[PDB]
Amino acid sequence: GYDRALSIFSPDGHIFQVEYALEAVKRGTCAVGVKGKNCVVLGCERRSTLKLQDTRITPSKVSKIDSHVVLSFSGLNADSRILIEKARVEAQSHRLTLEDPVTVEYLTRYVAGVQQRYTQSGGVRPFGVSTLIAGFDPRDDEPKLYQTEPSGIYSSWSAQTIGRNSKTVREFLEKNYDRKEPPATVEECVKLTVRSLLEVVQTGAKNIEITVVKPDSDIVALSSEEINQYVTQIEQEKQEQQEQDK
Amino acid sequence: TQQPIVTGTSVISMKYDNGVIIAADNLGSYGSLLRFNGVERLIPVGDNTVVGISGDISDMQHIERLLKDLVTENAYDNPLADAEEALEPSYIFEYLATVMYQRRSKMNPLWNAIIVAGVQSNGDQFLRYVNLLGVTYSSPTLATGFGAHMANPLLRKVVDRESDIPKTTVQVAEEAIVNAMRVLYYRDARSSRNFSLAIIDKNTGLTFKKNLQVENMKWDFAKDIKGYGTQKI
Amino acid sequence: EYDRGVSTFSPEGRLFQVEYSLEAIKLGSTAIGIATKEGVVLGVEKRATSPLLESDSIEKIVEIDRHIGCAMSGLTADARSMIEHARTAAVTHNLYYDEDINVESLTQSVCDLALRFGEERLMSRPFGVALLIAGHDADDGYQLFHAEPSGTFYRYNAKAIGSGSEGAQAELLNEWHSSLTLKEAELLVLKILKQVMEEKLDENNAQLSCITKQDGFKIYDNEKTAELIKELKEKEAAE
Amino acid sequence: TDRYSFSLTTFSPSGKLGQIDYALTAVKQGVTSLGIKATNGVVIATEKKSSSPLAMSETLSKVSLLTPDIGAVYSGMGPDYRVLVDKSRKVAHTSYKRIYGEYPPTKLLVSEVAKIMQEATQSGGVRPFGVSLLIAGHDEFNGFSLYQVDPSGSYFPWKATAIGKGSVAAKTFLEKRWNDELELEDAIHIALLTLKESVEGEFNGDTIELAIIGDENPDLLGYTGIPTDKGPRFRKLTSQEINDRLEAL
Amino acid sequence: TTTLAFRFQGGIIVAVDSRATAGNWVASQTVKKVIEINPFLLGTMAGGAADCQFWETWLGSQCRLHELREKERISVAAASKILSNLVYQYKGAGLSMGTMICGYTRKEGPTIYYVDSDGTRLKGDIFCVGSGQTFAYGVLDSNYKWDLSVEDALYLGKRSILAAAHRDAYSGGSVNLYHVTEDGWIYHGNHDVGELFWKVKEEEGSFNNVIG
Amino acid sequence: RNNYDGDTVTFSPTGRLFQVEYALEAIKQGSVTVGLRSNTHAVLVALKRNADELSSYQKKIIKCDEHMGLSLAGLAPDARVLSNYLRQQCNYSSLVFNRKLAVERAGHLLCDKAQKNTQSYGGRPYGVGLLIIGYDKSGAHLLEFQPSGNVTELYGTAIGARSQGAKTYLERTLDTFIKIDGNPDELIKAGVEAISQSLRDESLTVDNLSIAIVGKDTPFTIYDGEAVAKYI
Amino acid sequence: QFNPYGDNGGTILGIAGEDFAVLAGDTRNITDYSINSRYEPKVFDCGDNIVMSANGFAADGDALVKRFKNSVKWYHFDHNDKKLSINSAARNIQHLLYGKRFFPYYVHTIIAGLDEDGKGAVYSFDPVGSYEREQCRAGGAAASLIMPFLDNQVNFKNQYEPGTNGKVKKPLKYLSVEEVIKLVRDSFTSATERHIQVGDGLEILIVTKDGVRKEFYELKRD
Amino acid sequence: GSRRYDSRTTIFSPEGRLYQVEYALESISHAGTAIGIMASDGIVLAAERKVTSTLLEQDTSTEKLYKLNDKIAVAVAGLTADAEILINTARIHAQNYLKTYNEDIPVEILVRRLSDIKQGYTQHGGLRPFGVSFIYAGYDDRYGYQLYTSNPSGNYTGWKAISVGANTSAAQTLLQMDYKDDMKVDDAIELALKTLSKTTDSSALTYDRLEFATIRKDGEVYQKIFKPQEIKDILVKTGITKK
């Protein structure tokens, strides 16, 4: 019934609704993804503002699409749920018709196509969500990390960040990530993630949420105590650097 | 239509040197009852085409309505509808044939056999056949139903090949048509003595004769037939 | 802007959204194609927006069929559906006719989607990407086509689209001849790309591909492209 | 082609649904109507503001029957109320009686009509209803009840209330005059007093409408022989009865 | 119609006949019952001539589309399951087809699937489909061994098709042979049954039931 | 202009449809083409336009049926849409009635197809003008079609940029070319001269010239490239 | 109760030589035990030097021929007047027939022409589209009568070289146009002698690299 | 034609916000206050009636608290009619889940269904969003006692204690100051009543302007909707009033 063209071109060659969706993404909590030699780490920021929130039931920023692929997002949470549900449905459909779980690239491409269709269909607004999809291809040990934007563009990244203050975290990553020597162990990857988050998540480990993906469908979310241990070690090394200068 | 109700019997037609002739009785049969007398089954379209229909009378009237509507629609925005852009016999045929084949393929056919006969703009004699199955064929002599079994053998002895058409005159063809009508009245139970005959001649135009009757019938020998074998009185 | 319809005519006789999408393409990346009697060459600027972006995941040159390749410029997201429709069209024409679809026919079928927008079902906006469709058929040999969201398509001996398309096109007009070879076209695409690119062109921010009658449509790997880059460097150093 | 598929009632930056407030305003300019719930019946009443003295006021009824135990009165735009009473009767028949063999209780019928009215404030190509309704009903498990339904689609249960022009003064008078021990005739008297307050012109059985949801009137059933089927509880008072009760105001 | 396919140490052996009949009337004996889906996938048909031919060509089109989309060869499992879901969508409509999808991939190795119009899809090592599948099955299962040479396995497939063509009246014409290895399928010639029978009878000392 | 040029469903206070005029202006900013008929033949001469020197020349002549074709001026996609509809109509005529579609009826169908878009909200009127040549049971016919829905039969006309020169040339040459019966080459040369009467700082070449001919003993055929060198 | 199918008899034959093809058909259109017409051709020229015949149900045959002619027109319209290859025509006809897989054209289809290499070629289709390229194929009523004769006199089946102890088959050889015309005439005379649905006239279309020509011969009318 | 009248309710602002969502949130902020508090042995819902009149039948009045099933209740803030529409849909979804799986519906599933409905209304259709905020209080065998909240934006979250409607900031601050993880249901009742009495815009808290509900624990949960006399008794007992 309602087919009004909401996403149209502007005289300078811009689709305003898409750009405003990107801005809505920039207003959401921060999310980061980093590739190791044999693991992928996804870190996310929790809004310190809310204190009476019970984490036993509140949805986490990292959601499983299959047993081996996870998706984090920045932006509107409801559109994120929509995209995650569609992605899970498509993953099960690909499993059913191909007898093989989907590749991270394929799931990322499906999500990007959904977003692009929402940027070119009538009566609908684009998704106010940017996504980081991570995992390992079936029977493959090479890590996989991808990013999709509201505009429908998707691309692979050694390490990436989305959301508010993503510029600072991206600078920290471009500085402290050597393509030649990725974090060989899971500990190095998690430490780099927690550092990148601490560059902007000023409050503490309570607001940091870390998940680790390892081949053969090994997805585990770190407890707040382990994140606190990591933050404590990073602070002790920072104070050691402060003392070695003396 | 799934089974015909009121039906008309055979329709005969043949070519000659300057045109074509078609004819059919005026009977509408409700099965074994000769219910309706005076039922014209020759539909003249324009001044150059005649459509002879046999089968379900209701579908025949539907085809009459379709032909009238086709003439009306061809008249629309056509300053040459009375001339170079008039309805040719081939047009009327092709339209009816498309309709018949479509109605067959939809499992709701027009329970009819149609013979379109006329003269084209260049004087050529057009004479073609279609039926509820959509089967189309064209022969110098065309008949439907019992005619196809009885009328054609008589009419084919006058024009067995195309080369025989220039040799046949209007009188010859009309006499043959009348003889075939008489033979059908002899040997067809669903036939009538009253019929109609149309002549489409590339020079005189359309000559349409109604209320014709089968004449010169031989029945005297029936007085000498007594018993089915051994009976003598 | 929003006060009018998407399929509204300007007083000059043009469709607003079409011209705006043309501007959007102007702000797009660079794509250059050159067609010669020995094959067609397509080169694109990857334009990785960060050193952490894995440049391999920048597929701006896609295969429509073994005999038809395509390069995109602008909003590459929009290109997805077009590429799918093109591939499907090719395979469907094969299934229906046991033969390869003509390059011009594929380009026309792609363009038939461009103005299928507005308010059976139409898209809201026209496409925001332009295409260079290169191919080979037994009727018109090697062919290179430019396809715009304007529904119109042209056949170029050489064509550049995207940022810098003006100067690139001029240099093509000055450096093209009917006796051009395949290696010469590769080096020419490399030179024009290195000129119009803000970054120093290497085998990671540029991509090369070629359609030949023998091997079909092949995208050059990083090593062959880097060797061609070294050859062009030696050529330019000694001129 | 109904291209108006978008909402005509949206939120303004001040957090206001403009069309709903304007419907309520149009209601405020409507003729005063009122309802009073007693211990053994409910009463609804309103003023018969005719257009021309040539027009026959009895042919147009402001008080209408929904079900044999549920009646309704309104304030606002007449035609909206007429189409609403038609829809309410049909929905009471379909979404309940054709399923349970009995007429719906008052609360459920009010909820159905409120859903109908709410759809007007959110659906495409439509304005909210320009009426406010007072529904007086009786069911076996909830007794007597009086509900008010606003254009916003919201409804409230009232011990007694009024809507229209003299709404505030009427509500104040009812707060000062009502108690939880009134009989039906006491409620009728209080309603007549409140109407005499909220009217300036003539006040007689021919210029006011008043109906009651009280006891069952088997004489109005039209058929005898079923002991479980009693007469309807809704009854509009005749002009003679109205004038008889006015003579003792 | 008689088709057989079995995997062994040297890959996969596929063997079909070439007779197509319309009742007692042999409509043709030049029928190619192996459809080359792609250089790595073969499809053997049995049953509905138009059904099998049309839908295996459509399967080839779908496999080409998958290769274009995913930049990767389609697996024997996925290729067979596409046609399986198709025929199940057409189940009960009047399709009569029994096909074998055979392939060699790096992920799966050598793989053979049987798919019929009833929706059945079975991965297997030895399959025979058609009117003369029983004679094939007999000869195969009596002389089968995983340690067969390429020569011996090709000859065994040829001989099973030959026996099925001799006994079954609806199978005959000529034997079409195929060998599927890592590098794809290799065509091993069209052998006319009329002469192949006499050759095998003279060289094997078998078919002693026929006068010759 | 403003407040009345947003839709094709809005009438101007003077009684004008502005979107229609904007489509007509889109026509005016196109390549020039000319059509001329006698009583035995009908010729379309079109000047194909190119982007630059490395680009092809956009096709301007489309074949609708063995007896009828057209030349476009303006939007190429709308021209293709209308030509495909006309092909469909001629094909339906031939298949259902074994009849060649009259050029007049084709013009009527195109007029109604355009009027459909010039009155309904959503969607734009077509943005291309057409010159239709056709030989039917009444002889040769030339039609000029504007996306306003107006189609007119003429002995000769022209559309596109600077079409007035060709139109005046035909107005003067009418008494001459109406008599060129049974000589295709002379009518082709007359059309080439008519289209040359609309050139500014440009010369006719084999690459930019397209010819179309239909007639009694000539099915609708198109000449491009070396085939037109005989007229330059 | 309404039967949407019918049989019009008829017989068609297709032969392919070195640089030519020939498609012949009887011109007798019949129904039950009655003759409808003695000259109703069913071997048609469709253009691009491709001759087609769908023999069996006359309505379905005519419908299929008209659909294929329309397909050739639209193929010229939509592909720059590209000549339709014979294999492409065969594939398109397969799809046309399989379009009514569940309401088939009660016709056996045969097309003839030249391939891309300029050699003669014939393609045969069952009523649902299972197509095959062959060198000789007969279809229709007398098909069972002509096909074995064809296999004997065109592919030299069962014919061994004399004295070779039944070991050397007759060398398969391309036939001349005159010989295939003789074979067609003999096949159709035999069909007229033994089959009641064949006769009246034989019409032959010969497709060479120069185009399509017609040869008509009379047949018995019994 | 009709393009001139379309408000386009589902479009982004230049900042990246949904106009109608923010305006509905404002409208809800202008509505009554509702407070949910989850305890270790139960959950409590309290709400203030903005409809206040001495002639309002508070017995048959439920404008803030509604029952979804036997294990889930909702506190409403905003337009009551849109709230009832969504509540009807939620009850139907709960019963459909029951008919399908023969087990009571988990709370978060119902919450996510309602939130996705809201989001769909904030992305397509060109219709106005639902001007309603929901506080869900439920019990499932998986997570025990659960307290959720949802707004017109289609977003939903979970809470130990939460407030919606008017003056939510001061209410949340007070709750965070006075909440303890080990409190009981009576402590939750006291805290909710004190927060409502301290953040009310009226003279003082009275029973006639209150709705109260408790989900308590046998292996069976009890969903008690408080009646006027029970509300007056719990008010005078907790010390908010005296009589």
Ligand SMILES: C/C=C\NC(=O)[C@H]1NC(=O)[C@H](CC(N)=O)NC(=O)[C@@H](NC(=O)C(=O)[C@H](C)CC)Cc2ccc(O)c(c2)-c2cccc3c2NC(=O)[C@@]3(O)[C@@H]1O
């Ligand atoms: C090489 C692959 C299989 N080899 C065969 O040799 C198979 N033959 C065929 O498919 C022939 C082809 C031909 N050129 O004759 N099709 C018909 O005859 C047609 N049937 C007819 O009734 C007609 O004509 C009608 C007048 C028009 C449809 C088409 C058809 C229809 C429904 C079917 O369920 C089958 C075939 C079918 C299925 C499974 C096995 C066999 C079948 N039909 C059989 O005849 C066979 O038994 C044999 O196995």
Ligand SMILES: [Mg+2]
């Ligand atoms: Mg005979």
